[PDB]
Amino acid sequence: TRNLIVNPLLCRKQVVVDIYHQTIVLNGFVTKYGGGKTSGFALIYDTLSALKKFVP
Amino acid sequence: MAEQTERAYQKQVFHHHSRNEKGEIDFGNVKRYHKQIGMGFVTPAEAIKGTYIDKKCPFTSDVSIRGRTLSGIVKSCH
Amino acid sequence: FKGYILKITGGCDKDGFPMMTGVATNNRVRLLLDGRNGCYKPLRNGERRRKTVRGAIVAGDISVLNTIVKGEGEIEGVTNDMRAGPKRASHIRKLFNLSQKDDVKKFVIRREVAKKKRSKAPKIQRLVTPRRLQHKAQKLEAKKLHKIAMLKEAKRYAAILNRYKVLKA
Amino acid sequence: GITRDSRHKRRATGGKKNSMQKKKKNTMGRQPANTRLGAIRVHDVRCRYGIIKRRALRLENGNFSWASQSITKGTKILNVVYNASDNDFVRTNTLVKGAIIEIDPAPFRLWFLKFYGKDIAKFDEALLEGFQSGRVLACISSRPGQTGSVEGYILEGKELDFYSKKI
RNA sequence: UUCUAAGGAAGGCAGCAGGCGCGUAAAUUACCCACUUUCGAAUUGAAGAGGUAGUGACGACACAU
RNA sequence: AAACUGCGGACGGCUCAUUAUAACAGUAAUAGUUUCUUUGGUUACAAGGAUAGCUUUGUGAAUGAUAAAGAUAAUACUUGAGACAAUUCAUUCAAGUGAGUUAGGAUGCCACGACAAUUGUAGACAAGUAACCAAUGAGAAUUUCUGAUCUAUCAAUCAGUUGGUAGU
Numbered sequence A: 001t002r003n004l005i006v007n008p009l010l011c012r013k014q015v016v017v018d019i020y021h022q023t024i025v026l027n028g029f030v031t032k033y034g035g036g037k038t039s040g041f042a043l044i045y046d047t048l049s050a051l052k053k054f055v056p
Numbered sequence B: 001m002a003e004q005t006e007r008a009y010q011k012q013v014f015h016h017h018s019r020n021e022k023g024e025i026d027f028g029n030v031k032r033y034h035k036q037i038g039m040g041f042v043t044p045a046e047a048i049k050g051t052y053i054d055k056k057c058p059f060t061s062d063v064s065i066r067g068r069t070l071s072g073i074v075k076s077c078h
Numbered sequence C: 001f002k003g004y005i006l007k008i009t010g011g012c013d014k015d016g017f018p019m020m021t022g023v024a025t026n027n028r029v030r031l032l033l034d035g036r037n038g039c040y041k042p043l044r045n046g047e048r049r050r051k052t053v054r055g056a057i058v059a060g061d062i063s064v065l066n067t068i069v070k071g072e073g074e075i076e077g078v079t080n081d082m083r084a085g086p087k088r089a090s091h092i093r094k095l096f097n098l099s100q101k102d103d104v105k106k107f108v109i110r111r112e113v114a115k116k117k118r119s120k121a122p123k124i125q126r127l128v129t130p131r132r133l134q135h136k137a138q139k140l141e142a143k144k145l146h147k148i149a150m151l152k153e154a155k156r157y158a159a160i161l162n163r164y165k166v167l168k169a
Numbered sequence D: 001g002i003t004r005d006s007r008h009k010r011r012a013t014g015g016k017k018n019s020m021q022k023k024k025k026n027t028m029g030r031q032p033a034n035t036r037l038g039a040i041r042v043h044d045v046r047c048r049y050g051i052i053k054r055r056a057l058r059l060e061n062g063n064f065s066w067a068s069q070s071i072t073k074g075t076k077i078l079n080v081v082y083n084a085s086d087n088d089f090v091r092t093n094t095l096v097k098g099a100i101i102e103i104d105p106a107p108f109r110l111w112f113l114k115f116y117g118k119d120i121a122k123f124d125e126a127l128l129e130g131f132q133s134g135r136v137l138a139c140i141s142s143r144p145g146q147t148g149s150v151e152g153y154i155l156e157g158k159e160l161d162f163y164s165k166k167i
Numbered sequence E: 001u002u003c004u005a006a007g008g009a010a011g012g013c014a015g016c017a018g019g020c021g022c023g024u025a026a027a028u029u030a031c032c033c034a035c036u037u038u039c040g041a042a043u044u045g046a047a048g049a050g051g052u053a054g055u056g057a058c059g060a061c062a063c064a065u
Numbered sequence F: 001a002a003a004c005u006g007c008g009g010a011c012g013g014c015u016c017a018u019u020a021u022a023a024c025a026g027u028a029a030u031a032g033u034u035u036c037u038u039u040g041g042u043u044a045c046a047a048g049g050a051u052a053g054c055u056u057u058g059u060g061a062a063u064g065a066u067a068a069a070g071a072u073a074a075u076a077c078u079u080g081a082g083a084c085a086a087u088u089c090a091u092u093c094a095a096g097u098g099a100g101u102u103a104g105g106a107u108g109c110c111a112c113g114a115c116a117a118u119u120g121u122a123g124a125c126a127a128g129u130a131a132c133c134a135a136u137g138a139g140a141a142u143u144u145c146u147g148a149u150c151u152a153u154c155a156a157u158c159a160g161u162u163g164g165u166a167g168u
Helices: C089-095 C145-150 C153-167 D088-092 D106-116 D125-133 D157-165
Strands: A005-007 A012-015 A018-020 A024-031 A037-044 C028-033 C049-054 D041-046 D052-059 D061-066 D071-083 D099-103 D136-140 D151-154
Touching: C145 C153, D071 D088, D071 D106, D125 D136, D125 D157, D136 D157
Parallel strands: D061 D151
Antiparallel strands: A005 A012, A012 A037, A018 A037, A024 A037, C028 C049, D041 D052, D061 D071, D071 D099, D099 D136, D136 D151
């Protein structure tokens, strides 16, 4: 969806979630005015050893 | 002889003894130091032949001439 | 009682102001104090303050005099009679009449632990362990780099330079 | 403290100069140290940026150079005989740059004996008189209040005549 | 200006909140280092810098009846 | 944990009282100065005391108050082999730069004097330290040229004032 950034330095994959209506972290989600489309940004922290290490 | 009118002995900034005819340093005299300043300015003959002493003369001292350059008319010489 | 001889080594005024050894008056004086003479503990570095102190002359205003050699206030008295021992190996040889070559680990002051085990002693310093030459683990050793591993470069580098400085044609 | 700023002066027009700031460490000066003649007494002064200046309060010895013979020797300073700036420096024997002083030419004489095989006690006539009289004329060329030492040179032909006639 | 056992002692809000006074005239004695970045022995600790929240017809934009 | 040692609190934050060529803006110079940090380089099989936190006895109503004694460490303070560099002075040989008795070399002398007597068993590799070059640095600091509001019921002002020499 949208764009992919492969980020092995942070052991991470990040996407721009485009909703057409533990390793998962979701942030910055807001809908469009008048319902329907909702957008957001997702955080693929794969192994559960980065999530803790690389997570506030 | 005529430039030694002060309480101290007047010497140039760069004073060096010349070599005599036999090829060794002659401590009995001092070379008249004179340099040439930069952007297209000729050294007056008085800075070469003359025997005056000045530590602020741009031709016979270590004072440099930097970028700014102007012109004008002499107003007072007192 | 029979009494011995003592030397006054400190004291405090009735108001708690200490006594300065140098000051040779009876009353109280205000001086510019650093941490050098003791009577003022600085907070910052190089910070002085004008504090009040007492002279080195004893008088009736004194409340307690440490004059030992005690802790006696002034009629009364009070009294002070190896918390950790030395740590350097050179100090161990001094205390137990030990030479330079004999081992001192056999004569290190060991303290036991008695609680709900362990016979403790300080961390040693300055002995003869094979890795004591960590001090030369290499650590020393590694003058190498310095030792011509670098220095010969400075004659490698130098030399070939004078070559293409001499072509100059 | 002593200041070196130009905000306390007057303009070239003679008008007074008003004040906007206070004194600052950048334009800080220090009390001069008049290096007299006597037992060695020097002090270390922390300057700006942590550098250290050797403040020579009192000195007796100094290193002096003979230009003709290309030698430099240590020598005890005897007297100060001429200061071109202030005469009060002569009485107090203050050591500053350009102060004509009198030193004993003992090491220089000994060096001449070992090198030529002769004794001094062509050279300019007044130089010989200083050798036999035990007091030769030298000029201080260092800044004792900054470097903490007296470095100078023995006066020679044209400089000697000018300074000797002044005395 | 404050404490005091009356002998003595520290303190400088033109820092963030707040109080008195002055004037026609100007806001919470809030929460957090998650954003930006700074300092430090350092990936981690602090930061009334900074961010978020509260008052806000100073102003600016869209918009009900 | 606390404490010694190191670094920092000179940045950031607030205000506009002072200030009339002062400050500030553009500009140019430093061949007239220059740190800190960071970056690139260059130059004895191990010695000596004492000090805190620690223990003990205390004073004062009290402060971020303070007194004695007994010990104990260093990348704290010192000595010391490992073998030059940088300063001052005097003389001298001299190439880039618009321009330098200039960077630089040689001779003699004084002072100064090193590359921890350092640290990880674990995350030889590190890490640390002293001086000296250079960058950071169109930075900081001084300085050049030009540029400000009203007022003549302000017309003459200045004596370190303007310059010179020597010094500090």
